[PDB]
């Protein structure tokens, strides 16, 4: 809530003692303390007894006034008590709120909260100050009265009076205590008015800080979402290439396998598992020596079946291999020189021709392998990039997570300050609807009217609606008065008028008042209530209407009722007779006192 609202409506009043010194009818209102020094003006026996009667009956009057004057002080005192209960409740809260180092603002509100409570307490303290003044005034009168007696000695006289004067003055001081006191009150309220504006000022100031903070956050958000696009694309342009590579490699390794499976190929891959062989039939012819002259028909074979040897060949000559791995060195192995030389050359040609073969074969796998690895080393090159795209994109997705987080917080923050900022205004303006109410009440029905209205809200606040039967009992007593006065056509008007109420239309006022007066719960059969209220003014039954009231308001608080009646008076005409009858009936459910004042002003 943050506001008090009980203040601003019904601030301390402090009404001074209405006197009227007595002008005794006995013995010429003379008093024995009156000048007599050089005369004889003596009070006869009857003169005295009479004077005694007057003074007696009179004192009694001040006496009754006083007893009832106390009672009021008493209830006040009770309210002072509660007023204090709060001051404490609040104060206590403030301290811990500081023990935790709550936000300057939380505390600023709390302080302002204890302030109003404090003002409240002081409020009642002032009201007490007045009652006491009254008791003093009554007293000095009591004495003054007793100071005329005529049964006393001029001594006792002059003393009784001196006493009275001393007392009346005290009373007068009392008067000045309250008044100053009553001024102070307002002198403090003003500070509240200041203290609240500070609150409102800084309240908006904070709002802004959030409004602008959530601004960067929004301009950030967009930018982030922009960046997201870019990166999301770059990941593509990367992955796009990633495939080209993998495709290249796929085709490459494809090629390698091909070259690795050539019959000769396999031998490069494995001499032993797949020996590389080659042979050629030669029809060598010899001449000269008839012992060998002919045509030798042989078959030159050669085979490679070992890494050791395969390597050597690829790295040497056939002739060499022939001469260094086989150690077939001298071509001449037999008596047939020509043949032996020709055969050898043939034997060697093989190695030469197989070498060329396994050789080329090697190269084929060679070229492929460089291809392969080149592709295999561009794919990787590319994958490094893919990471540095996906990762990069993700990092951004994180800030997305974080901006949204930072923002939501802020959203909430602003909403909250808003609901709080609103309520204040709502309760403020409300506190202004009621003030604006009581006044026009003064303008249409004059003085007595407002004073009643308030005094009704005066009790009410804190007390629950009175028991039905106990309620009717009060009204029935004030029956032939509240109906005596003026109730002719007026009655039929008051009724028909009451009936014609559009709950729908007056609903809002009820909501404003309730707040302005302190009730916030829930009404329930208002459409009916009013209706019953009507029939009630026609048939003077009163019971069901009274019974109904016990059953319309949540906490059964009088405060809501008053708020209700305030609404009905705001959606009709009725007039001074009407205002009366209502306040009167309603009062008989809050407190009998209100009725007296009701029946006493019209």
Q: Which of 445, 469, 489 is the last residue of a domain?
A: 445
Which CA distances in Å does 492 have to 534, 584, 601? 9, 17, 21
Cα 452 off chain centre by: 39
Q: How many CB atoms lie within 10 A of CB 260?
A: 17
Torsion 232-235-240-243 (CA) sign: negative
Measured CA to CA, the distance from residue 494 to residue 441 in angstroms comes to 18
Radius of gyration of the chain (CA): 59
With a CB cutoff of 8 Å and minimum separation 6, the contacts of 600 are none
Nearest alpha-carbon partner for 527 in 490, 492, 564: 564
Helix (H) or strand (E) holding 12: none
Which CA distances in Å does 495 have to 130, 436, 487, 504, 529? 41, 26, 11, 19, 13
Which CA distances in Å does 120 have to 78, 81, 113, 229, 433? 13, 11, 11, 63, 21
Measured CA to CA, the distance from residue 133 to residue 167 in angstroms comes to 11
Same domain, 216 and 178: yes
Nearest alpha-carbon partner for 545 in 534, 554, 556, 553: 534
| Inter-helix orientation angle 503-517/558-569, to 10° | 130
Biggest CA pair distance of the chain: 213
Q: How many CB atoms lie within 10 A of CB 114?
A: 19
Same domain, 332 and 278: yes
Q: Which of 336, 362, 388 is the last residue of a domain?
A: 362
Which CA distances in Å does 243 have to 240, 378, 379, 388, 440? 6, 11, 8, 16, 86
Residue with tokens 């006065």: 485
Measured CA to CA, the distance from residue 173 to residue 169 in angstroms comes to 6
CATH classification of the domain holding 4: 1.20.250.10
Torsion 316-321-325-330 (CA) sign: negative
Burial class (CB in 10 A: 0-12, 13-18, 19+), 176: exposed
Residue with tokens 């080393």: 377
Tell me if residue 86 falls in helix, strand or coil: helix
Measured CA to CA, the distance from residue 602 to residue 486 in angstroms comes to 8
Nearest alpha-carbon partner for 197 in 435, 415, 428, 515: 428
Nearest alpha-carbon partner for 224 in 406, 481, 437: 406
Tell me if residue 523 falls in helix, strand or coil: strand
HEC-encoded secondary structure of 449-489 = HHHHHHHHHHCCCCCECCCHHHHHHHHHHCHHHHCCCCCCH
Same domain, 132 and 199: yes
Measured CA to CA, the distance from residue 460 to residue 473 in angstroms comes to 19
The structure tokens listed for 342 are: 């020709």
Same domain, 440 and 293: no
Measured CA to CA, the distance from residue 388 to residue 241 in angstroms comes to 14
Cα–Cα–Cα angle for 503, 426, 95, nearest 5°? 130
Q: Are 133 and 175 within 8 A, CB to CB? A: yes
Same domain, 541 and 589: yes
Same domain, 593 and 520: yes
Q: Give CB contacts under 8 A, 24+ apart, made by 336-341.
A: 336/286, 336/289, 336/292, 338/286, 338/287, 338/288, 338/289, 338/292, 339/284, 339/286, 339/292, 339/296
Measured CA to CA, the distance from residue 350 to residue 354 in angstroms comes to 6
Measured CA to CA, the distance from residue 424 to residue 92 in angstroms comes to 23
Same domain, 179 and 63: yes
Question: Which residues pair with residue 334 across a beta bridge?
Answer: none
Burial class (CB in 10 A: 0-12, 13-18, 19+), 298: middle
Nearest alpha-carbon partner for 13 in 74, 76, 78, 68: 76
Nearest alpha-carbon partner for 9 in 599, 314, 460, 338: 460
Which CA distances in Å does 32 have to 60, 139, 150, 161? 22, 21, 6, 11
DSSP string, 252-302: HHHHHHHHHSSHHHHHHH-TTTS-EEEEEEEEEE--S-TTT-SEEEEEEEE
**What count of Cα atoms within 13 Å lies in the side-chain half-sphere of residue 325?**
23
**Full residue range of the structural domain in which residue 135 is found:** 1-261+363-445
Q: Are 12 and 128 within 8 A, CB to CB? A: no
CATH classification of the domain holding 286: 3.30.305.10
Helix (H) or strand (E) holding 200: helix 154-260
Nearest alpha-carbon partner for 22 in 60, 49, 76: 60
Q: How far apart are the first and last CA of the chain?
A: 39
Burial class (CB in 10 A: 0-12, 13-18, 19+), 50: middle
Tell me if residue 388 falls in helix, strand or coil: helix
Measured CA to CA, the distance from residue 591 to residue 471 in angstroms comes to 8
Q: Are 542 and 472 within 8 A, CB to CB? A: yes
Give how many domains the chain has, as a whole number: 3
With a CB cutoff of 8 Å and minimum separation 6, the contacts of 173 are none
Same domain, 232 and 145: yes
Q: How many CB atoms lie within 10 A of CB 295?
A: 9
Q: Which of 404, 425, 445 is the last residue of a domain?
A: 445
Q: Are 301 and 277 within 8 A, CB to CB? A: yes
DSSP string, 403-414: HHHHHHHHHHHH
**What size, in residues, is the chain?**
602
| Inter-helix orientation angle 104-146/45-99, to 10° | 170
With a CB cutoff of 8 Å and minimum separation 6, the contacts of 220 are 403
Same domain, 369 and 509: no
Tell me if residue 474 falls in helix, strand or coil: helix
Measured CA to CA, the distance from residue 74 to residue 343 in angstroms comes to 149
Cα–Cα–Cα angle for 73, 77, 82, nearest 5°? 150
Burial class (CB in 10 A: 0-12, 13-18, 19+), 423: middle
Q: DSSP label at 303?
A: E
Cα 288 off chain centre by: 125
Helix (H) or strand (E) holding 524: none
Residue with tokens 């800084």: 202
Same domain, 134 and 223: yes
Q: What is the chain's percent helix, strand, coil content, to nearest 5?
A: 75, 5, 20
Nearest alpha-carbon partner for 11 in 455, 424, 310, 568: 455
With a CB cutoff of 8 Å and minimum separation 6, the contacts of 543 are 468, 472
Same domain, 463 and 556: yes
Tell me if residue 14 falls in helix, strand or coil: coil
The structure tokens listed for 116 are: 């109003």
Q: Are 8 and 433 within 8 A, CB to CB? A: no
Q: Are 252 and 372 within 8 A, CB to CB? A: yes
CATH classification of the domain holding 569: 1.10.490.30
Q: Are 339 and 292 within 8 A, CB to CB? A: yes
Tell me if residue 398 falls in helix, strand or coil: helix
Measured CA to CA, the distance from residue 52 to residue 286 in angstroms comes to 191
The structure tokens listed for 130 are: 């007045």
Measured CA to CA, the distance from residue 117 to residue 123 in angstroms comes to 9
Same domain, 239 and 110: yes
The structure tokens listed for 362 are: 């090697």
With a CB cutoff of 8 Å and minimum separation 6, the contacts of 14 are 126, 127, 129, 130, 178, 179, 181, 182
HEC-encoded secondary structure of 26-56 = HHHHCCCCCCCCCCCCCCCHHHHHHHHHHHH
């Amino acid at each position: 809530e943050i506001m008090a609202v009980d203040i601003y409506v019904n601030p301390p009043r402090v009404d001074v003692f209405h006197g009227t010194p007595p002008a005794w009818s006995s013995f010429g209102n003379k008093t024995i303390w009156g000048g007599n020094e050089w005369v004889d003006d003596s009070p006869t026996r009857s003169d005295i007894e009479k004077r005694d009667k007057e003074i007696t009956a009179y004192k009694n009057t001040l006496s009754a006034q006083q007893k009832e004057n106390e009672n009021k002080r008493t209830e006040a005192g009770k309210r002072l008590s509660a007023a204090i209960a709060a001051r404490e409740k609040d104060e206590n809260t403030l301290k811990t709120l500081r023990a935790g180092n709550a936000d300057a603002a939380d505390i600023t509100r709390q302080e302002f909260r204890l302030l109003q409570a404090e003002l409240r307490e002081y409020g009642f303290r002032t009201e007490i100050a007045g009652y006491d003044a009254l008791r003093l005034h009554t007293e000095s009168r009591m004495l003054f009265a007793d100071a005329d007696s005529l049964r006393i000695s001029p001594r006792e006289a002059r003393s009784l009076i001196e006493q009275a004067e001393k007392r009346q003055k005290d009373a007068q001081n009392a008067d000045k205590k309250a008044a100053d006191m009553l001024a102070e009150y307002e002198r403090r309220k003003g500070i509240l008015d200041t203290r609240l504006s500070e609150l409102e000022k800084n309240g908006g100031a904070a709002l802004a800080v959030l409004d602008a903070q959530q601004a960067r956050l929004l301009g950030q958000q967009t930018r982030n979402d922009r960046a997201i696009s870019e990166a999301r694309n770059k990941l593509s342009s990367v992955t796009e290439s990633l495939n080209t590579a993998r495709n290249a490699l796929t085709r490459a390794e494809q090629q390698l396998t091909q070259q690795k499976n050539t019959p000769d190929g396999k031998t490069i891959v494995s001499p032993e598992k797949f020996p590389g062989r080659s042979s050629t039939n030669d029809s060598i012819v010899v001449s000269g020596d008839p012992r060998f002259a002919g045509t030798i028909k042989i078959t030159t074979s050669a085979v490679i079946d070992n890494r050791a040897n395969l390597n050597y060949l690829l790295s040497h000559s056939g002739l060499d291999y022939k001469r260094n791995i086989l150690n077939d060195r001298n071509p001449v192995v037999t008596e047939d020189v020509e043949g032996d030389k020709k055969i050898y050359n043939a034997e060697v040609a093989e190695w030469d021709k197989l070498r060329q073969r396994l050789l080329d074969a090697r190269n084929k796998i060679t070229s492929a392998e460089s291809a392969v690895n080149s592709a295999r080393n561009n794919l990787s090159a590319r994958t490094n990039e893919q990471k540095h795209a996906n990762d990069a994109l993700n990092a951004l997705l994180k800030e997305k997570e974080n901006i949204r987080n930072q923002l939501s917080g802020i959203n909430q923050k602003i909403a909250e300050e808003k609901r709080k900022q609103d309520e204040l205004k709502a309760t403020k303006d409300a506190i202004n609807f009621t003030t604006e109410f009581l006044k026009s009440v003064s303008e249409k029905y004059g003085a007595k009217a407002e004073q009643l209205a308030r005094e009704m809200a005066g009790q009410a606040k804190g007390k629950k609606i009175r028991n039905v039967e106990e309620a009717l009992k009060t009204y029935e007593k004030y029956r032939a008065d509240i109906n005596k006065k003026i109730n002719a056509k007026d009655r039929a008007a008051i009724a028909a008028a009451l009936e014609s109420v559009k709950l729908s239309d007056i609903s809002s006022n009820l909501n404003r008042f309730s707040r302005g007066l302190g009730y916030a719960g829930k009404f329930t059969s208002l459409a009916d209530w009013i209706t019953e209220f009507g029939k009630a003014v026609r048939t003077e039954n009163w019971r069901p209407l009274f019974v109904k009231t016990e059953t319309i308001i949540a906490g059964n608080a009088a405060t809501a009722l008053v708020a209700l009646v305030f609404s009905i008076l705001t959606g009709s005409a009725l007039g001074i007779i009407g205002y009366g009858l209502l306040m009167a009936v309603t009062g008989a459910l809050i407190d009998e006192s209100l009725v007296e004042k009701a029946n006493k002003f019209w």
